Amino acid sequence: GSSGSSGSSFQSTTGHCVHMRGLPYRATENDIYNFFSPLNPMRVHIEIGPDGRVTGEADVEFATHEDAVAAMAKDKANMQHRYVELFLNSTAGTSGSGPSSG
């Protein structure tokens, strides 16, 4: 199978992600998009409680890490009239350059 979105195993999609919590009832992706702008979130997942009512949680995915930290800049910042919690979740690659690469 494996078409898109759904699949098997965790298999880190990218690594750099952002968790959302305590979101407003009148909060929509479109907002979650401008709430992190200027930026481009790979995708904003909206967690639904029953079958329509939101839960206040969301998941933001980014191509790179920067996009994350950049989005993390809006951590706590009230999106509309509520305080959503943003948890910086990334994997980060490798870095650090010195003399004569050992």
From Swiss-Prot:
Sequence repeats lie at residues 81-96. It comes from Homo sapiens. Component of a ribonucleoprotein complex containing mRNAs and RNA-binding proteins including DDX5, HNRNPH2 and SRSF1 as well as splicing regulator ARVCF. Interacts with TXNL4/DIM1. The chain holds residues 281 to 369 of 449 of the full protein. The modification Phosphoserine is found at S37. It comes from the Eukaryota. It is linked to Intellectual developmental disorder, X-linked, syndromic, Bain type: A form of intellectual disability, a disorder characterized by significantly below average general intellectual functioning associated with impairments in adaptive behavior and manifested during the developmental period. MRXSB patients manifest developmental delay, intellectual disability, autism, hypotonia, seizures, and dysmorphic facial features. Only females are affected. It is found in: Nucleus, Nucleoplasm. Expressed ubiquitously. This protein is a component of the heterogeneous nuclear ribonucleoprotein (hnRNP) complexes which provide the substrate for the processing events that pre-mRNAs undergo before becoming functional, translatable mRNAs in the cytoplasm. Binds poly(RG). This is Heterogeneous nuclear ribonucleoprotein H2. Residues 16-91 form the RRM domain.
